[PDB]
Symmetry: D2
Subunit: 295 residues, 4 copies
Amino acid sequence: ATNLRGVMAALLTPFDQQQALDKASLRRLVQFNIQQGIDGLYVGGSTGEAFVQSLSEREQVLEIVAEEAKGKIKLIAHVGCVSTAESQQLAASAKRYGFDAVSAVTPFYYPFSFEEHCDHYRAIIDSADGLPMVVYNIPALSGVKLTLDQINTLVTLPGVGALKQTSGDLYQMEQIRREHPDLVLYNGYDNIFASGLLAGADGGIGSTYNIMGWRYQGIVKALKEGDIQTAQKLQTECNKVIDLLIKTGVFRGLKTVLHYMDVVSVPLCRKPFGPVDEKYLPELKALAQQLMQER
Amino acid sequence: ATNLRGVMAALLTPFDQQQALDKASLRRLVQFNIQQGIDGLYVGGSTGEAFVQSLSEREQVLEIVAEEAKGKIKLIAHVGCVSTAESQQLAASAKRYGFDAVSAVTPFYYPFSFEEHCDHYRAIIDSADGLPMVVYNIPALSGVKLTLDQINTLVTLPGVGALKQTSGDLYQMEQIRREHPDLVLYNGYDNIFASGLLAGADGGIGSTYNIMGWRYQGIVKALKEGDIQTAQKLQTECNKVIDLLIKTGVFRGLKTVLHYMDVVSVPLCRKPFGPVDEKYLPELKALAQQLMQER
Amino acid sequence: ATNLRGVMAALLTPFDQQQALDKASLRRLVQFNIQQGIDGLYVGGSTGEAFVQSLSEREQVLEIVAEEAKGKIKLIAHVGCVSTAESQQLAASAKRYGFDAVSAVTPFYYPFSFEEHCDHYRAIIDSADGLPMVVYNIPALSGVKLTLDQINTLVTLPGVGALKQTSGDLYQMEQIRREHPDLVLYNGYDNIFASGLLAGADGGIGSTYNIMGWRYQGIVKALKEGDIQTAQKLQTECNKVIDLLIKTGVFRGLKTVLHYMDVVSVPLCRKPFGPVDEKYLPELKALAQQLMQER
Amino acid sequence: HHHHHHATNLRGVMAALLTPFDQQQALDKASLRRLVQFNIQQGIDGLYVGGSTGEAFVQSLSEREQVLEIVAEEAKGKIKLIAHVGCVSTAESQQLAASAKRYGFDAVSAVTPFYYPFSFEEHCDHYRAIIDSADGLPMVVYNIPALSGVKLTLDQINTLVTLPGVGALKQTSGDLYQMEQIRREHPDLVLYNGYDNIFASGLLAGADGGIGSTYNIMGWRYQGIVKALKEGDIQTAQKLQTECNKVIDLLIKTGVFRGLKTVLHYMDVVSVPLCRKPFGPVDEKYLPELKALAQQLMQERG
Ligand SMILES: CCCN(CCC)C(=O)[C@H](O)[C@H](O)CO
Ligand SMILES: CCCN(CCC)C(=O)[C@H](O)[C@H](O)CO
Ligand SMILES: CCCN(CCC)C(=O)[C@H](O)[C@H](O)CO
Ligand SMILES: CCCN(CCC)C(=O)[C@H](O)[C@H](O)CO
């Protein structure tokens, strides 16, 4: 688990104008992240548009990422589905491709009990056969509202080695750090990263790292040097970008920046996501140039 | 839409001890519903555990139900998935198997714009090729919170013949009816059926109809005849049953009652749903006996 | 408390352009409700703008209404404040003025424990010295979310004789009735009144009854006779009005209609409520005329 | 924005003053004077009087004025004084605003009016009417979605805090993206962090101070957090926040206001540690921990 500490980009999954997987742009996105000095990749997550892909499509992506990056950076495979059995098939494939860790969102849509959530995690942990599990918590999207004691139980299940904390409650962040001094604890909301680190997170997983992951590692560095102004200046610049991405749609906006940075051929998300509003293309192109000249 | 008015049971998907589709019990459940005098079946919806099934499993159930019941009662295929493309495949298949209509839940998990929801429905309607669309609204589960104006636009899309209203807001039920005098409008919450018809619904789609559909037909008849005491008494008996099912877990409780009714071989839902707590089996066995005495 | 069953108008408190109480319009509005055939008045509730008045103002209104109506119709005094001691002073004043019952909204703003709520009601009941209590439940405004079990404990407290159920959940409406066969159970949402009565309510307390209370009485009649069609027509007509009142602002729209019916001199609510938008006045004026013609 | 510049002197760490009561639940005046002096000696920059913490919403206007008057007698000119004058009623809030001016307060404040749904424009007029009655005292807009039920957008918050006469925001919200957004839009705005359990994180996000209820019993820790961060000493800032949160953990279990009043009782400041009904008493079993906490706090602050 300890080697899982770090700044991990939640990888986007490129598609073509036919909505098919674009494998050439995936390979390029993987190499691009590595060149920015990212610690690892979180593959097939919410950011990866997991839940509009087939299991087969998810596996193909996991396989290719592993081909490109195994041994060079850490690789966490998000294998979560609503189904335990579907989640187990993806866990076993992650193991076969040599991933360092697996991950699963709290199963969603149907109300499940906390005990059913634990057994779900237990099954996936077994099928991962030695890979540590990152319990993925995102109430805003999943509608699963765990109490702190429930969170505490999840993180001490045999084989759990990390929590992806996609929550803006930095009180809870602090309570988790205080209860589990050694837990790998990822900040999930990009736009509060600096504050999340201050509250007790030791790293993060985020969609925006795909295009400015060096800024987030600047924040970890700046904070560790004790340089608050630089930490704040960097968070502020991240949030200027995040404002625009929320206006445009986050995933399709990030893909569009990556298109102008010559990485992703076609910046589409799968339907029912629609295309970026074309009036936002200048801002997005300019941001691309800004970021390209910056690093 | 006209001939789509009525009481339609939200079909459960039966599974064998290995959590595979139990074909024999499925066919048994279809006929058993028909023998209760239901107007139709709503196949592959939430109640049918669609969201823990693959597209081919969902197709297999649709085909078998068409075999058992095409031309004897009305058949509606819930083909909704998060992905538009996935929902399109299921729609094309429902057409091939000879279904009367298609239906789709508002795509969930990722937040989609309302126009995005509109295109999603347009695309599924094209792929259904003549089959009317039943728009399926369930804020509680889907997390999508439509305004009345947005509901009005959706239900007037070319090819929409109906709205499944799984909401407890009976002001909105009446408003919808007032705006659309001829819309087929299905009450979705079993425990307000009587009240929902009074507010403007002209039928229902429900999970608990699988074991007591004749009660819901009895509520329709009684209200039709100005027979209010009888309506209230039937709704009360339905709610005594619904109290218990909410305690046991609704899908698995229903399947367990059907197991004591000699319809379902193994009353399990798919993981992560767990089993029924052993302490409730006496109560559910009692219930089975009572409903068999009845009729 | 069988004698408290019925359709009670939630009395508006008239004000002048200086924002002081208008006692001449208050007296006129009381007689107007009595002439309309109403069963009682609910005085100084939410509709009565209690929470922008002092205790002395609230007492001045309770006194005037008792002078005007005691012995002619039933009188319920809403005495609730956030403070228990303040609510007791009002409960004592209501007893002195010869009210038939007291009522208190679940105390708000500060989160209080359920037991803290129960003691609150006990103390008010004591100060009321023999006047039955109407527990006033309105989650949407109060922010207090009681479970069914908690509701059951409140309604069986010694000295409670009724429940004002301002909730859209008609399943809970049925469950409360089923548990408490003799409880006086008031429907709080005017726009689901017919459906509320069907689910188990035996009456109502409502703001819109001030201008068309005879319609709600017609709904009770129609449903006692099994005339569902008239009940629906009346509820639909109530809801056309409620749609407009929601656009104009409800209390002030009601007060404006009353101004055109020559009952209220000045149709203002207290600041921070603003005035009705003048573009609505032709509609409010036509409504007044329509309702005056109907009788 | 000129009203923001003029309120620059309001930046700081301000305790949300509790209101002590006697055995009959009337104002305990001796204890209030003690509590006020006790806050001053901790090195607190100021007091926020008659807010949620002060149990305003179970007091009459006359009781709120009495508290305002007494606190001014005790602290005027020595530390900054902000008067929470907010009621649901605009006119009630205006009376309290005028009184606060008469007693020499440095600023007024009003929670967004609650219970009834008001439009945004109706909110703006409410603040404007109260600003008029404050007669030159700057306004601190007090935002607390959790308790108020009022859910303002960022654009609406931007408009509120730039109304003429406004010079500060009390932001009792745990959304630190919005904290940063407010700071970036309003470089000179006084911006108080409202949730004690995230103070250090709120400051990092853009707050330039805080208003809180736990400052009554450990305000020097929050000053310690401000100093640690100014110097770039992250370890000291984190250790102080951690200790504040161990204390907040306990108070959430006991009840926050009554738990604070009890600690202060064991610190010899408050005579009777009750809140007003329908608040109930602290559970007997928590008294050992609360005395223990009082002892630890008097130790570390010698
Ligand atoms: C409501 C905030 C939604 N966000 C934050 C924008 C960066 C997201 O869904 C992000 O993708 C999340 O923080 C993971 O990167
Ligand atoms: C919470 C009430 C249970 N439900 C939902 C089924 C999980 C119902 O009563 C509805 O009738 C359901 O949507 C389908 O019948
Ligand atoms: C949100 C509006 C619903 N209503 C009914 C309007 C007639 C109310 O909130 C009423 O003020 C309430 O039901 C009291 O009659
Ligand atoms: C989730 C923390 C709740 N808190 C923090 C102090 C215990 C509060 O509600 C406070 O009363 C608020 O921050 C004002 O100090």
